């Protein structure tokens, strides 16, 4: 928990196809924006812990002088076991992936899982230490103890004795934080790009400094605010120049990116971000963010700045982040073909044509492949900007990061819990393709299908009530939505889960259709394997979903998980040997389970089960039959310890065999003349390290010197 396990999962982001299909101009745009993002992500070290910048500098020197493979021999010569050496690599990979020594998931410190005395032998005997003996000794003295310290006040991000933070000086309390917020509010000044430093005089009187992040120092709209203030008896000073040499690098790259931008919204947003990072102006960043919202469906999508305020103990200061995510043009093309045949494909669905929408509208779904996501962590989706005023007047972007979602489940053979040995190789090979098919169907044909029957305030219907027949009754429709009731309002508790279930089930049902598979590029045995793995993944995910059921509250904590479990329950109810979940004894003697899906019964048993289930789901949804809908859905979503599945017992097994969150390796891009190439790394701790070793080829040592200088300037505050 305060360590990352030696066997931590690792996945590499796949942006290969998408990047290949970028034009030369879009490649150069993505190249410079990626450089901007990776440069800026370095500031996150300063925004994490006093020691983080030095740890980064030290690890970076170490791995530059010796590859993880060259250091390996050195480590063994110093008497580290293979496991101790792996513990170091995992630790370094963790620092790099979090931009600091605190997990971005949980905000808890992590330390190396090996004796400090052994690590010291490796560091001080390294080639880096041979090249710069005083500097490496100095870095180790500076960060060695803190690298390992689990003093209670350092275990978590926070204030005082409860935690550590570099958003504020070490002497700050929540009272200080609130006072600063009141001051900033009074001056209409955003906290997002700020830190708070408190000096205390001989009499214990506090003096406050609000420091803005900017290239420019304290030697536009910002200029007038850089001065002294008195606020409720407290002196306040507003200054700027935080992270200046890092932001200078960011700005250089944003300026270069402008040459390759796709439209004037992109050109203007980048000019505004440059002003923001140069002057320290959130007002400028908001203007840029407005332009960004106006830039609809760009091929190369990006955002950059002090965006999220989760890690500030007070919750108002942003952590730096930057991303570049791209439209996969091949996937766009496939989706367009799916949409072009939507009329025909919809007719295959198990409800009557009268229960279908009068005309097909492509749902508002956007998926992009991440090329770069810099900072402390990579989310599987984005929903931004966070500026409430802008969200209301202009809107926001809500986008899936498809290649990050694609590695949500296990991507390594040895991590495939609950699968039979003979399914493991297939699963690893066909997982990616099956995901692409499932997503496209789910989002487009799943959420894009089905009509609600509505009676309005005048008594008028949106369907032909004289002639539409409920296939379950053989009679005219007698149940419908009234009083402006909606799906969400009528089916309060289950609306979201039931709809995801219906959409996921459309995915499984339509992935059987040879025309769908042909669009996605699959025929023959390969198409059969894509089908099988899609279904296998779904049933395994329904077992795994039990983590998100709370037995004591008889309550499901996550809509999507509940939906997956329901699908499992539908396929189990079908019987005939299609799917079984059996509690077993693991190879280690502890409780385990086996998911067995008979591929030969998917069409003959699975298809008709989903036919019946989907027909029921839609009829009950269309007619707004909440009592019927609740009975059906809550029935399947019920978790009991009944044999032979013993799902409550299995939930414990699921939690037992649960492993920590995986690390994600990201690619690099390299410029040669006007050509940009993609560099990829192995999915391992060594691979992730190498990805960072190669990330700053022009100026890595300059950046490390910048980081340690900035850290040293502020060291007295902690
Ligand atoms: Cl009815
Ligand atoms: Mg503290
Ligand atoms: Mg992909
Ligand atoms: Zn959905």
UniProtKB/Swiss-Prot annotation:
Coiled coil segments of this chain: none
A Pfam short name: Peptidase_M49
Catalysed reactions listed for this entry: Release of an N-terminal dipeptide from a peptide comprising four or more residues, with broad specificity. Also acts on dipeptidyl 2-naphthylamides
Cofactor: Zn(2+)
Disulfide bonds: none
Gene Ontology BP annotations: proteolysis
Subcellular location: Cytoplasm, Cytosol
InterPro entries named among the record's database cross-references: Dipeptidyl-peptase3, Peptidase_M49
Regulation of protein activity: Activated by Co(2+). Inhibited by EDTA and o-phenanthroline (in vitro).
GO CC, alphabetical: cytoplasm; cytosol; extracellular exosome
EC code(s) of this entry: 3.4.14.4
Details of cofactor binding: Binds 1 zinc ion per subunit.
Annotated positions binding Zn(2+): 442, 447, 500
Principal place of residence: cytoplasm
Keywords linked to the UniProt accession: Acetylation, Aminopeptidase, Cytoplasm, Hydrolase, Metal-binding, Metalloprotease, Protease, Zinc
Function field: Cleaves and degrades bioactive peptides, including angiotensin, Leu-enkephalin and Met-enkephalin. Also cleaves Arg-Arg-beta-naphthylamide (in vitro).
Family that this chain belongs to: Belongs to the peptidase M49 family.
Official protein name in the record: Dipeptidyl peptidase 3
Species assigned in the record: Homo sapiens
UniProt gene name: DPP3
């Amino acid at each position: 928990q305060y360590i990352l396990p030696n066997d931590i999962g690792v996945s590499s982001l796949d942006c290969r196809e998408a990047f290949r299909l970028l034009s030369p101009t879009e490649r150069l745009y993505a190249y410079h924006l990626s450089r901007a993002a990776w440069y800026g992500g370095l500031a996150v070290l300063l925004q994490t812990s006093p020691e983080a910048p030095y740890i980064y500098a030290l690890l970076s020197r170490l791995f530059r002088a010796q590859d993880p493979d060259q250091l390996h021999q050195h480590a063994l010569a110093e008497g580290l076991t293979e496991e101790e050496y792996q513990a170091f690599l995992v630790y370094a990979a963790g620092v790099y992936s979090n931009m600091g020594n605190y997990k971005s998931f949980g905000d808890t410190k992590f330390v190396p899982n090996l004796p400090k005395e052994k690590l010291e032998r490796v560091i001080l005997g390294s080639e880096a230490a041979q090249q710069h003996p005083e500097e490496v000794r100095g870095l180790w003295q500076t960060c060695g103890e803190l690298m390992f310290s689990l003093e209670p006040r350092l275990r978590h991000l926070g204030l005082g004795k409860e935690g550590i933070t570099t958003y504020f000086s070490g002497n700050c309390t929540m009272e200080d934080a609130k006072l600063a917020q009141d001051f900033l509010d009074s001056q209409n000044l955003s906290a997002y790009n700020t830190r708070l430093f408190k000096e205390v005089d001989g009499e214990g009187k506090p003096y406050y400094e609000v420091r803005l992040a900017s290239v420019l120092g304290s030697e536009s709209e910002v200029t007038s605010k850089l001065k002294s203030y008195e606020f409720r008896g407290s002196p306040f000073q507003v200054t700027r120049g935080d992270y200046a040499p890092i932001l200078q690098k960011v700005v250089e790259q944003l300026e270069k990116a402008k040459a390759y931008a796709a439209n004037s919204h992109q050109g203007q947003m980048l000019a505004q971000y440059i002003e923001s990072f140069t002057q320290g102006s959130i007002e400028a960043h908001k203007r840029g963010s407005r332009f960004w919202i106006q830039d609809k469906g760009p091929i190369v999508e990006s955002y950059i700045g002090f965006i999220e305020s989760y890690r500030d103990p007070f919750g108002s200061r942003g952590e730096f982040e930057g991303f570049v995510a791209v439209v996969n043009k091949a996937m766009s093309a496939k989706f367009e073909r799916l949409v072009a045949s939507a009329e025909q494909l919809l007719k295959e669905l198990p409800w009557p044509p009268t229960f279908e929408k009068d005309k097909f509208l492509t749902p508002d779904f956007t998926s992009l492949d991440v090329l770069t996501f810099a900072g402390s962590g990579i989310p599987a989706g984005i929903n931004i900007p966070n500026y409430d005023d802008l969200r209301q007047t202009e809107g926001f972007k809500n986008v899936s990061l498809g290649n990050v979602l694609a590695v949500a489940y296990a991507t390594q053979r040895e991590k495939l819990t609950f699968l039979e040995e003979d399914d493991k190789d297939l699963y690893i090979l066909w997982k990616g393709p099956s995901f692409d098919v499932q997503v496209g169907l789910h989002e487009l044909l799943g959420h894009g299908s089905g009509k609600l029957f509505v009676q309005d305030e005048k008594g008028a219907f949106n369907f032909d009530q004289e002639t539409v027949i409920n296939p379950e009754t053989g009679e005219q429709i007698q149940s419908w939505y009234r009083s402006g009731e909606t799906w969400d309002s009528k089916f309060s508790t289950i609306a979201s889960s039931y709809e995801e279930c219906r959409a996921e089930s459309v995915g499984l049902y339509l992935c059987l259709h040879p025309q769908v598979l042909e669009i996605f590029g699959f025929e023959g045995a390969d198409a059969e394997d894509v089908i099988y793995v899609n279904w296998l993944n779904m049933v395994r995910a329904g077992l795994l979903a039990l983590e998100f059921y709370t037995p004591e509250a008889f309550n499901w904590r996550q809509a999507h998980m509940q939906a997956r479990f329901v699908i499992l329950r539908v396929l189990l109810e079908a019987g005939e040997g299609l799917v079984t979940i059996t509690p077993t004894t693991g190879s280690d003697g502890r409780p385990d389970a086996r998911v067995r899906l008979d591929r030969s019964k998917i069409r003959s048993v699975g298809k008709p089960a989903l036919e019946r289930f989907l027909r029921r789901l839609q009829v009950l949804k269309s007619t707004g039959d909440v009592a019927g809908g609740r009975a059906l859905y809550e029935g399947y979503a019920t978790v009991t310890d009944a044999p032979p599945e013993c799902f409550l017992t299995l939930r414990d097994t699921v939690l037992l065999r649960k492993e920590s969150r995986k690390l994600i390796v990201q690619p690099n891009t390299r410029l040669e003349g006007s050509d940009v190439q993609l560099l990829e790394y192995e999915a391992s701790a060594a691979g992730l390290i190498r990805s960072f070793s190669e990330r700053f080829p022009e100026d890595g040592p300059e950046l490390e010197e910048i980081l340690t200088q900035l850290a040293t300037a502020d060291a007295r505050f902690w």
